[PDB]
Tab-separated table of C-alpha atoms in Angstrom:
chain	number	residue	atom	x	y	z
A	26	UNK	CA	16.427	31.297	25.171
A	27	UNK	CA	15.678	27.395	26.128
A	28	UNK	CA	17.605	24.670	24.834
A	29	UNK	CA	15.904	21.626	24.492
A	30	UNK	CA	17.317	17.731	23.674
A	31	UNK	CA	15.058	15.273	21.987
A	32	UNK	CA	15.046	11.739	21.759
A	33	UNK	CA	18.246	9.611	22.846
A	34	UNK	CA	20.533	12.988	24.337
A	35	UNK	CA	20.890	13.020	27.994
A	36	UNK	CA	21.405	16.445	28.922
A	37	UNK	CA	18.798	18.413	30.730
A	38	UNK	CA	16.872	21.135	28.936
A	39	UNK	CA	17.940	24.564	30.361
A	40	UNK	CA	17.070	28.383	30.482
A	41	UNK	CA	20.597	30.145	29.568
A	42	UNK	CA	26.659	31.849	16.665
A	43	UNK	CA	27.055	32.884	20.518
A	44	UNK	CA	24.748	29.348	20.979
A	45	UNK	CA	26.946	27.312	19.052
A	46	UNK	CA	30.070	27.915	21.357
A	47	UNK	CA	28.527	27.246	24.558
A	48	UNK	CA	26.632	24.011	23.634
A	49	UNK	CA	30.083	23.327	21.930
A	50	UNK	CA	31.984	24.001	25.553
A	51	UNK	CA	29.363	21.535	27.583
A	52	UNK	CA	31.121	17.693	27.108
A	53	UNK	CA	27.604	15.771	26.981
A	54	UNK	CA	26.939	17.035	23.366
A	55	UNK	CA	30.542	16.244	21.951
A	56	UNK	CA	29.029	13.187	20.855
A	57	UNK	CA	25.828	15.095	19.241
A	58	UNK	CA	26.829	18.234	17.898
A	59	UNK	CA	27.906	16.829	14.351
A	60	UNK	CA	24.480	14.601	13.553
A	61	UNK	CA	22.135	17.082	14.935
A	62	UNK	CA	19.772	19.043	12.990
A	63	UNK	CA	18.194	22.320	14.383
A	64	UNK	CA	14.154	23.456	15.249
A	65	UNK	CA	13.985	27.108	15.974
A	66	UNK	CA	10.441	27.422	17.805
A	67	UNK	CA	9.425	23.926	16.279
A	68	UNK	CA	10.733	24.839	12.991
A	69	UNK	CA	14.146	23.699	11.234
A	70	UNK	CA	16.781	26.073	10.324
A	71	UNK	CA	20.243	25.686	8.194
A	72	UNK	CA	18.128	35.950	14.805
A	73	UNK	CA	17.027	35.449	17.521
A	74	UNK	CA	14.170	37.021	20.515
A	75	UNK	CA	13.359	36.525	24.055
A	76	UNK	CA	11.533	33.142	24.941
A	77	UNK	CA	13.107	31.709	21.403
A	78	UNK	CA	13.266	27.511	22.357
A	79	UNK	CA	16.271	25.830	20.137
A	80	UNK	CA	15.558	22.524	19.354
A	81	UNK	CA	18.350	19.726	18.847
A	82	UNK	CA	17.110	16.828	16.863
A	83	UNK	CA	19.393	13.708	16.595
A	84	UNK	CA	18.850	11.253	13.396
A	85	UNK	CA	15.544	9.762	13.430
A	86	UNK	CA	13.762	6.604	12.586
A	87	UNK	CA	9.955	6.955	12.704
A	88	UNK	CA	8.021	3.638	11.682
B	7	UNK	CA	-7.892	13.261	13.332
B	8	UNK	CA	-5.544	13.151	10.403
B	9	UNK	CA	-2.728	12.719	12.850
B	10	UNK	CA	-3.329	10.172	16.037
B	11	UNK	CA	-0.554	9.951	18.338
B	12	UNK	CA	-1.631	6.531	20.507
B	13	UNK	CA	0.127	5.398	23.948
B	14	UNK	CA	1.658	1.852	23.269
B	15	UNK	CA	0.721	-0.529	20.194
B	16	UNK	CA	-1.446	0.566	17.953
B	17	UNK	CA	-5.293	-0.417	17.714
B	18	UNK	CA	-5.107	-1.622	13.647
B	19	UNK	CA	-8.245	-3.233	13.567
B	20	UNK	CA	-10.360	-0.782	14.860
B	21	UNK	CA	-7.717	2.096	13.086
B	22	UNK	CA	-8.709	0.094	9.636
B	23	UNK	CA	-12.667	-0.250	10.418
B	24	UNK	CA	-12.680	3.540	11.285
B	25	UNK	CA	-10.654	4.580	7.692
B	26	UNK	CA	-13.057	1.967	5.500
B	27	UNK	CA	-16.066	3.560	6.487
B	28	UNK	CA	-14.752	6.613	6.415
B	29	UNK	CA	-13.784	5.477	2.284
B	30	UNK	CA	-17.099	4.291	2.042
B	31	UNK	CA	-18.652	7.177	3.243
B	32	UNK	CA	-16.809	9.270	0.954
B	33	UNK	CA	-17.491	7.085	-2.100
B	34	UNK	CA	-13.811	5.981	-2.487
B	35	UNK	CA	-12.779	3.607	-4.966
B	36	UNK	CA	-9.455	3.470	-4.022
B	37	UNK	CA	-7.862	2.483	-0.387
B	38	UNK	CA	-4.177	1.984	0.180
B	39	UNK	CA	-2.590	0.970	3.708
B	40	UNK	CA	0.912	0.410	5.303
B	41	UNK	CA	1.070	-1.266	8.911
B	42	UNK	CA	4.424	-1.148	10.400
B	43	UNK	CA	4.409	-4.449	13.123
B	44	UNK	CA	7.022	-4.449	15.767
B	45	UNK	CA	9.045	-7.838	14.900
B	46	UNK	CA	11.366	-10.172	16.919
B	47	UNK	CA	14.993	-9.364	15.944
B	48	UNK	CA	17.761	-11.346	18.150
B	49	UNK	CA	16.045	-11.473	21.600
B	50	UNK	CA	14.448	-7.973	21.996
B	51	UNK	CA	11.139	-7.235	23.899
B	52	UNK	CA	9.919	-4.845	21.393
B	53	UNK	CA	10.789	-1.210	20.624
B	54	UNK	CA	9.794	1.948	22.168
B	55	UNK	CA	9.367	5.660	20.571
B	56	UNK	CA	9.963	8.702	21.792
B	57	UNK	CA	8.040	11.596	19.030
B	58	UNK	CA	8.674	15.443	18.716
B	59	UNK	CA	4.618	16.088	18.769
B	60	UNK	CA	4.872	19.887	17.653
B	61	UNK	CA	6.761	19.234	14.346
B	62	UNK	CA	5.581	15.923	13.782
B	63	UNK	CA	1.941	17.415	13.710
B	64	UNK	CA	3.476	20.645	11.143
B	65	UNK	CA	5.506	18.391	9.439
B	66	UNK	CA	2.511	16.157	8.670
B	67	UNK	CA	-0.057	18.785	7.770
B	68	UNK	CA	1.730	19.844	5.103
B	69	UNK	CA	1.826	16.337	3.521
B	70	UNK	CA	-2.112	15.889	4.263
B	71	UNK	CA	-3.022	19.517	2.666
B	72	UNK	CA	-0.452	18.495	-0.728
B	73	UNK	CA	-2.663	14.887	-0.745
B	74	UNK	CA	-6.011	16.759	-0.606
B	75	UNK	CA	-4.969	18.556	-3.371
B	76	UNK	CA	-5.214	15.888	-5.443
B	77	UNK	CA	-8.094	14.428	-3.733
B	78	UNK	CA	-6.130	11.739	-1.631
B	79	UNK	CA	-7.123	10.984	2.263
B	80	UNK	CA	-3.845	10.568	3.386
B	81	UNK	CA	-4.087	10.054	7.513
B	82	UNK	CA	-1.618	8.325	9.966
B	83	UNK	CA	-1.228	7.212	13.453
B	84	UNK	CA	1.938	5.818	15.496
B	85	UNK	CA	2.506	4.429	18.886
B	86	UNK	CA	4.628	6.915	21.740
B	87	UNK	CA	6.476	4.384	24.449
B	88	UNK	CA	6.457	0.933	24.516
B	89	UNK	CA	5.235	-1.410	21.563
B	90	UNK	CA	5.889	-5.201	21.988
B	91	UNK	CA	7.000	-7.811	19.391
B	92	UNK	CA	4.184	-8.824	16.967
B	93	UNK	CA	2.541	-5.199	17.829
B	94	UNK	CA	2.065	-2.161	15.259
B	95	UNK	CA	3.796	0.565	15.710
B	96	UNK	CA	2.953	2.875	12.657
B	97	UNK	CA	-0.034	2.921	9.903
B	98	UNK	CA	-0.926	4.709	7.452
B	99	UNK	CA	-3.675	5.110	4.729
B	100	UNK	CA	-3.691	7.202	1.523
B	101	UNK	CA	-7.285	6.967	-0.164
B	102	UNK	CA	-9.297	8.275	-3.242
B	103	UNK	CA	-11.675	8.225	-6.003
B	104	UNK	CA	-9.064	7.182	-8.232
B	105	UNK	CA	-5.723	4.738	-7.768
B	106	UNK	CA	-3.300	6.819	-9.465
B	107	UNK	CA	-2.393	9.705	-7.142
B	108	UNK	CA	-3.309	7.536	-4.168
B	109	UNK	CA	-0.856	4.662	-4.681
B	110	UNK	CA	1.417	7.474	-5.432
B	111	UNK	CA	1.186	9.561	-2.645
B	112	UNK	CA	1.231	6.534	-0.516
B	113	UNK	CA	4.923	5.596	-2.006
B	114	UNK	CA	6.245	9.098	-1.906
B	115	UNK	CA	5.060	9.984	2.051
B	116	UNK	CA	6.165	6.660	3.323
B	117	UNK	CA	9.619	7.132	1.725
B	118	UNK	CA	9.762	10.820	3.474
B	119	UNK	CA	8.174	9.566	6.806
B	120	UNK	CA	10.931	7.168	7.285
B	121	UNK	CA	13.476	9.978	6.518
B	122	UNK	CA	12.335	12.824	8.077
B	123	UNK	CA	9.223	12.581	10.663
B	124	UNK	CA	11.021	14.049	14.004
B	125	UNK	CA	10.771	10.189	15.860
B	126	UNK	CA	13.151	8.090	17.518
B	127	UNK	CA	13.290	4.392	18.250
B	128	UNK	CA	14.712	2.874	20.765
B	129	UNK	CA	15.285	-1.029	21.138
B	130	UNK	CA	13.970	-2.987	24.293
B	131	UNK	CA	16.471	-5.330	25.487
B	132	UNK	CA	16.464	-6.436	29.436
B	133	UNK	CA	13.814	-3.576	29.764
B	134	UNK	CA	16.271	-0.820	28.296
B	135	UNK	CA	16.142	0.903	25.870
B	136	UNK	CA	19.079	1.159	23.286
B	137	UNK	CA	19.372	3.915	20.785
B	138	UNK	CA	18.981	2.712	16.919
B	139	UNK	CA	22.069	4.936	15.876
B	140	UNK	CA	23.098	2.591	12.885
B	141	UNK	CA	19.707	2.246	10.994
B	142	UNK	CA	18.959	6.100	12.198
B	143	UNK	CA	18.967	9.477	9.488
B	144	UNK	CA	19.968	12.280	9.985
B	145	UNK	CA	17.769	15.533	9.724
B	146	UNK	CA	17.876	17.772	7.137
B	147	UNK	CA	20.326	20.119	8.228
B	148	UNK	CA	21.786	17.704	10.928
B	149	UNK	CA	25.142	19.550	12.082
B	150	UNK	CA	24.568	23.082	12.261
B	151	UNK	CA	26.635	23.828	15.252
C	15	UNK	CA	-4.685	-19.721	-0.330
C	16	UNK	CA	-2.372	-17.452	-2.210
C	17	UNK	CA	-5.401	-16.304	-4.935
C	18	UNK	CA	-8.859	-16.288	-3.759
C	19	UNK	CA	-11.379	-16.004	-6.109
C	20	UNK	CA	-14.603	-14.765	-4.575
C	21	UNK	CA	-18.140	-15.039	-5.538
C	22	UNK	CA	-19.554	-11.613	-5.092
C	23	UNK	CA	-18.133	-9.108	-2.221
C	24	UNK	CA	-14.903	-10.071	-0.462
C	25	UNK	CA	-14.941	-9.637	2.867
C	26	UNK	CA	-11.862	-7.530	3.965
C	27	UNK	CA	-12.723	-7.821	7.299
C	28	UNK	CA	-12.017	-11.501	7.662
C	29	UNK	CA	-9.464	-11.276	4.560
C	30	UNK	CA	-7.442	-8.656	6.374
C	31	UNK	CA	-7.642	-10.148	10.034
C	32	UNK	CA	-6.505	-13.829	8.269
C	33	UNK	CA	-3.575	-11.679	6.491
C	34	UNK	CA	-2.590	-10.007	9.560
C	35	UNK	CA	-2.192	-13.212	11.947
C	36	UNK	CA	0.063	-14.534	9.219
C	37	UNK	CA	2.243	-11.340	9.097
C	38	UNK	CA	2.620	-12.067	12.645
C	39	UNK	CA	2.718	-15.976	12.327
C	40	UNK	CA	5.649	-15.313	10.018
C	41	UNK	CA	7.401	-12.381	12.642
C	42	UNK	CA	7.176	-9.804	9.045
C	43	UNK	CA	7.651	-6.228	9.689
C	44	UNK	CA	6.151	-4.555	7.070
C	45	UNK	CA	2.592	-5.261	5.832
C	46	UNK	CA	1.471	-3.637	2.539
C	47	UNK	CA	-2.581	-3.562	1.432
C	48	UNK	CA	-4.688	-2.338	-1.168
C	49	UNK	CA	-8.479	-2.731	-1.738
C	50	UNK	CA	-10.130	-1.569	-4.717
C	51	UNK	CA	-14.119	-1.111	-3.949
C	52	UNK	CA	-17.055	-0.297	-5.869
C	53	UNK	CA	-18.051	3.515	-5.651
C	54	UNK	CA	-21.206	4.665	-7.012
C	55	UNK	CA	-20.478	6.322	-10.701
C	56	UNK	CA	-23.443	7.860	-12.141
C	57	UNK	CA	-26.099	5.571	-11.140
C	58	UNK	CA	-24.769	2.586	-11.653
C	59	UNK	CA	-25.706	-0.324	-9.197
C	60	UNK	CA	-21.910	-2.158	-9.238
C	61	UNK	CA	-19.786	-3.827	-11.237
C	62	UNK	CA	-19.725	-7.080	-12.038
C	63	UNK	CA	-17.094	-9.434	-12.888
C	64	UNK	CA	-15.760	-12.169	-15.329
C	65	UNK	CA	-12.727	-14.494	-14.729
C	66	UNK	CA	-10.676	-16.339	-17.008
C	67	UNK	CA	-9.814	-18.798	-14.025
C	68	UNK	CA	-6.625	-20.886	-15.133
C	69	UNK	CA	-4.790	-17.977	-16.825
C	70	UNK	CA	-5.401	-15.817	-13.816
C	71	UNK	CA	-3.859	-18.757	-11.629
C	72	UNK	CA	-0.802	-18.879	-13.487
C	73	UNK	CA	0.220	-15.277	-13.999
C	74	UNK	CA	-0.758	-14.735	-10.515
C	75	UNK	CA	1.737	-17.637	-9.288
C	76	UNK	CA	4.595	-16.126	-11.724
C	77	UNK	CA	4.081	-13.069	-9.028
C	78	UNK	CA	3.837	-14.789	-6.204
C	79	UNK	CA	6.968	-16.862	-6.479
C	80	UNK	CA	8.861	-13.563	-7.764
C	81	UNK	CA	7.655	-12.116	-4.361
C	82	UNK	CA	8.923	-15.484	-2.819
C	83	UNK	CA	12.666	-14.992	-4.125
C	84	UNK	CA	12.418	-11.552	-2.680
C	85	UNK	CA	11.578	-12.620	0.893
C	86	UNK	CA	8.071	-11.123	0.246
C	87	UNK	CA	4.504	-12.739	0.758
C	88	UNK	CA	2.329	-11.483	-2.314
C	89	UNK	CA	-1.168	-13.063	-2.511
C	90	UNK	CA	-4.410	-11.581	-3.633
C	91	UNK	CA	-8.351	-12.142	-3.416
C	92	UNK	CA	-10.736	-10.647	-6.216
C	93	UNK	CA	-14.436	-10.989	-6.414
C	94	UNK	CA	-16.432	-12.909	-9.433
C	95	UNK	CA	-19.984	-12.271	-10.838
C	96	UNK	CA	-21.750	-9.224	-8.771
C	97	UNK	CA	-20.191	-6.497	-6.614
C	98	UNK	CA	-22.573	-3.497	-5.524
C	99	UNK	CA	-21.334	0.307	-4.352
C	100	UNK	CA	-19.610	0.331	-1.295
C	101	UNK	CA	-18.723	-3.131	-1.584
C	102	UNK	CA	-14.760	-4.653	-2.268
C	103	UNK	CA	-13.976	-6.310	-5.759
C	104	UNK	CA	-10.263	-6.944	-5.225
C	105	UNK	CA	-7.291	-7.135	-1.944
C	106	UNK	CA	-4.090	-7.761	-2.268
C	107	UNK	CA	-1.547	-7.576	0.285
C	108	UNK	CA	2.664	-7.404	-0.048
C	109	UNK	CA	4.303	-8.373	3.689
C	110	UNK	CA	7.769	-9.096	4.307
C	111	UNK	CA	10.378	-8.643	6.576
C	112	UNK	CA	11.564	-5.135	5.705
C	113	UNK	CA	9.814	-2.531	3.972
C	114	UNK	CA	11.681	-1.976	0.883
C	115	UNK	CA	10.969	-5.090	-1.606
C	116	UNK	CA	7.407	-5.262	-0.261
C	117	UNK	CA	6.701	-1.829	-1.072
C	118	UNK	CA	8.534	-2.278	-4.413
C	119	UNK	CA	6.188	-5.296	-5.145
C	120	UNK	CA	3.286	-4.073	-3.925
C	121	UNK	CA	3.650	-1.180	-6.832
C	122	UNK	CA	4.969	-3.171	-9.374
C	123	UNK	CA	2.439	-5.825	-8.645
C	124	UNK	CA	-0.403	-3.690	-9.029
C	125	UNK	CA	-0.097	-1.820	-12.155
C	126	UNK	CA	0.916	-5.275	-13.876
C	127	UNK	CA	-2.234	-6.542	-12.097
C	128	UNK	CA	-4.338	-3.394	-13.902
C	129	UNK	CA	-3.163	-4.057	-17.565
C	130	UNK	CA	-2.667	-7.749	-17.652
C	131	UNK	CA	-5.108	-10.010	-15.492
C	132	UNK	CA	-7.513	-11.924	-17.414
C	133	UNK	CA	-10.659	-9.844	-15.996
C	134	UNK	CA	-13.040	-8.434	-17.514
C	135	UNK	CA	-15.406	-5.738	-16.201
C	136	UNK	CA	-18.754	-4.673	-16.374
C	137	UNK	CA	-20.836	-1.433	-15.254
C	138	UNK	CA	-24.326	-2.940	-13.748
C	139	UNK	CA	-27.016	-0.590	-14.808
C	140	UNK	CA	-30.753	-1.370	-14.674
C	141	UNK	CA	-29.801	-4.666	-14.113
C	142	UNK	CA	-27.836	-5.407	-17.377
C	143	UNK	CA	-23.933	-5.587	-17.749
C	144	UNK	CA	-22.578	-3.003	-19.280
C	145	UNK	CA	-19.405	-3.958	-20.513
C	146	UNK	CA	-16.383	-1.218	-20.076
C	147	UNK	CA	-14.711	-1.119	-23.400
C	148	UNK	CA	-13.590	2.328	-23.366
C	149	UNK	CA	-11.417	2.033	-19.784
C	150	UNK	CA	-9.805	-1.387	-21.225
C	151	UNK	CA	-6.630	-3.226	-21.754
C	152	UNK	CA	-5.664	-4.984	-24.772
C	153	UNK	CA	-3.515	-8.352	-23.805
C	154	UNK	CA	-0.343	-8.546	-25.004
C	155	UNK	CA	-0.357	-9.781	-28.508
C	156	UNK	CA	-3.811	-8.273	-28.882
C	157	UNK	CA	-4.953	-8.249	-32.848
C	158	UNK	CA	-3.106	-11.746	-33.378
C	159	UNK	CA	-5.533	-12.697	-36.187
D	4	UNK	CA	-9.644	-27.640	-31.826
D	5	UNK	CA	-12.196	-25.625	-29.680
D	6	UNK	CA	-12.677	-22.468	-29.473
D	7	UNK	CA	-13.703	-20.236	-26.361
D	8	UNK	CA	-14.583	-16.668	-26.054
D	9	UNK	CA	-14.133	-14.835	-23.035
D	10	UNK	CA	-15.762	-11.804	-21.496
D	11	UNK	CA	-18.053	-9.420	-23.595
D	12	UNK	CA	-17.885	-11.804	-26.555
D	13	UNK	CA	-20.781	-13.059	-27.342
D	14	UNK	CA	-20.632	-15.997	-29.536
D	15	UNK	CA	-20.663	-19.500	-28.274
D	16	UNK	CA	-17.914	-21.626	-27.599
D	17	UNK	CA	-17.338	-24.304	-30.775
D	18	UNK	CA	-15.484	-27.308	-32.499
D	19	UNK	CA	-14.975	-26.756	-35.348
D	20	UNK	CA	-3.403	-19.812	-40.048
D	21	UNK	CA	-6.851	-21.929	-41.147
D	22	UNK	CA	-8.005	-20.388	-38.069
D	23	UNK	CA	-8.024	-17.173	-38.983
D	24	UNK	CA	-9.536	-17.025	-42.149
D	25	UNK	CA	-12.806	-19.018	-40.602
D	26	UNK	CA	-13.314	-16.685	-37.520
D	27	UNK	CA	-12.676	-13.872	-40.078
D	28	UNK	CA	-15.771	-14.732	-41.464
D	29	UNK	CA	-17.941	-14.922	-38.638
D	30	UNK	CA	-19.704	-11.838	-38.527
D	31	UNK	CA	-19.987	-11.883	-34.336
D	32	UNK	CA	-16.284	-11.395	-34.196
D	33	UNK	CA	-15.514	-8.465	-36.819
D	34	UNK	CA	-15.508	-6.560	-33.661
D	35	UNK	CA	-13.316	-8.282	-31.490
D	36	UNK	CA	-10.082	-9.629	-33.727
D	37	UNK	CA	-8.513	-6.308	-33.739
D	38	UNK	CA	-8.509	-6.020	-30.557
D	39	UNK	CA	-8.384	-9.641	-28.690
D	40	UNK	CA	-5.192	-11.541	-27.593
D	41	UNK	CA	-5.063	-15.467	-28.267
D	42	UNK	CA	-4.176	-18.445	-25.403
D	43	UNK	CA	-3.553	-21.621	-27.051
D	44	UNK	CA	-3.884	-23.506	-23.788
D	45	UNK	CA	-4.318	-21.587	-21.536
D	46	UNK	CA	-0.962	-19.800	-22.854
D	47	UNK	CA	-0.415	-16.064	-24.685
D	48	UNK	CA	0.449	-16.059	-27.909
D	49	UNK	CA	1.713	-13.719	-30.562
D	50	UNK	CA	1.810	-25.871	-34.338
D	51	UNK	CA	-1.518	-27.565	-33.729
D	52	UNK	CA	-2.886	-30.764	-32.403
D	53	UNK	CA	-5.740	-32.436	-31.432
D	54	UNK	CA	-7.695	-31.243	-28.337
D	55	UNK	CA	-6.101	-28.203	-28.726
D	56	UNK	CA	-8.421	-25.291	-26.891
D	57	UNK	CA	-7.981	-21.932	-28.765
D	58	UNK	CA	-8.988	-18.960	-26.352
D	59	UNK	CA	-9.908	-15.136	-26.974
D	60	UNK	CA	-9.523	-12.931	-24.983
D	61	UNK	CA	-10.913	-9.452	-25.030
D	62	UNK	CA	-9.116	-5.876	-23.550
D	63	UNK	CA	-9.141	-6.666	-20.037
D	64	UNK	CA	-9.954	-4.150	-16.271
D	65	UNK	CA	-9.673	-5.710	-13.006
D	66	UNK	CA	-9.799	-4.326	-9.849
């Protein structure tokens, strides 16, 4: 899988419920982890494959 | 395009020549527009946007395809990057034969744009950029993890 | 002005430009416009327009200073006599500072606009006015006598 | 008093509950009292004195 941070997070993306605890262990998403919504290959979710990209999407405010 | 994705400040006037004609053209009788303009708040620079193309585009669609089914044009473009005070930033158009579903449509997508198109604003202060967290919203499913 | 009344076709162009530079003039954020224009029904040449001039000022200023308490500029343009296909009868335009009580006018403005100005409309075929009885309004307090 | 008639009305403006009864008797206007609002002024309706402009006003459609 590839995790990948939109708009105002820091963090790199990178290449490595067994998602949530490692993004959970990594102390530049502390801040993010509560607000953020989630884009499975550029679609949002509330499985998983090889080449699957997770999306984290903070609040927005388009206009 | 339905969905134009410019670098910096939008072009309005030529953006709202383009759309006319294009109402004209399609013997329109009704023509409804939004322009979001970049204003001076405190001492800022202007604002700058950082847009999830992908879903935005998806996202979009779907509200184009539901306004064509009621014979609305609904189109929209907004800036990426920098846009300066006095600058727009975001327009939109919803247009028709008739006034009714187009003044409607134009009410109801604005309202969800502001809520839920996958963008981000930043403010320009001292050329940085600060994060809008206050006035931001949070996606629909926004703490998963 | 804050109501223009227009012999024959506005022209948006230079309505729209003039409304703009004020937006920014007056450092508003949001910027709210509709146009109604002439399509070709049938084969009807345009519409055509009469104005009951001094009523039409005064309801339209009850608006405008409503706007006013709001933080909102409301004002309005709308043609008289002869308006052909393709060509626009009527602009208005709801700016502001923030979105929210500009888009709330702009609705609320409109609709009152549809059922209560002092306008009265006419189909032009073959060169005579036809007059549109059947899409009408009746005034409030309509069958007084 | 005058009296005007605005939009499809036809009948010419003239000089000449009084009121009623004599425009109910013009024939031009058995089409249009059921159906038209009254301005005294310049002002809806739903007193009298001299000068007084009396104004009809016919189902209205702008835009």
């Amino acid at each position: 899988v590839e995790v990948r941070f939109f708009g105002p997070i820091k963090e790199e993306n990178f290449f490595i419920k067994e998602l949530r605890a490692i993004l959970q262990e990594k102390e530049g998403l502390k801040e993010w982890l509560g607000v953020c919504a989630i884009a499975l290959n550029d679609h949002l979710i509330d499985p998983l494959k090889d080449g699957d990209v997770i999306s984290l999407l903070p609040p927005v405010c388009g206009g | 395009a339905v969905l134009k994705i410019i670098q910096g400040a939008l072009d309005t006037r030529e953006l709202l020549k383009a759309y006319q004609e294009e109402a004209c053209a399609k013997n329109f009788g009704a023509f409804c527009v939004f322009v979001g303009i970049v204003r001076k708040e405190d001492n800022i620079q202007g604002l700058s946007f950082d847009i999830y193309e992908a879903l935005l585009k998806t996202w979009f669609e779907k509200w184009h395809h539901k306004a064509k089914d009621l014979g609305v044009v609904l189109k929209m473009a907004h800036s990426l990057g920098d846009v300066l005070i006095g600058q727009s930033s975001f327009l939109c158009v919803s247009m028709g034969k008739n006034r009714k579903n187009a003044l409607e449509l134009y009410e109801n997508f604005i309202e969800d744009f502001k809520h839920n198109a996958p963008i981000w604003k930043y403010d320009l202060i001292h050329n940085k950029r600060i994060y809008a967290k206050e006035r931001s919203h949070p996606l629909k499913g926004s703490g998963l993890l």
